């Protein structure tokens, strides 16, 4: 809690009232980790950030349906 209160991640501090565990994930691969925790229904993911953009769970599952990064670069 002090490292979240003093740094730029103060908006993530309300997600830490119970037993919470962190999913540190270099090179974000979000679709398949959603696909492996959709096996167990009782496991929430309360949110987090994606590259300094704080996002919710339904935000995560609609972030997974962003198109592939080459075509996202090639749209503009």
């Amino acid at each position: 809690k002090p490292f979240l209160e003093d740094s730029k991640y103060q908006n993530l501090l309300p997600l830490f009232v119970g037993h919470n565990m962190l999913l540190v994930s270099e090179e974000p691969k979000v679709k398949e980790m959603v696909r492996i925790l959709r096996t167990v229904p009782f496991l929430p993911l309360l949110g987090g950030c994606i590259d300094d953009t704080i996002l919710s769970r339904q935000g995560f599952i609609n972030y997974s349906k962003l198109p592939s990064l080459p075509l996202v670069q090639g749209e503009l």
Partner: peptide, 27 residues
């Protein structure tokens, strides 16, 4: 006109998504 180069290289993923949304609706 490489100002575009710098301010789009500083652009994040969903930042580029917002740019896509805005310019496509405008264009």
């Amino acid at each position: 006109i490489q100002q575009l180069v710098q301010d789009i290289a500083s652009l994040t993923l969903l930042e580029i998504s917002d740019l896509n949304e805005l310019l496509k609706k405008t264009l």
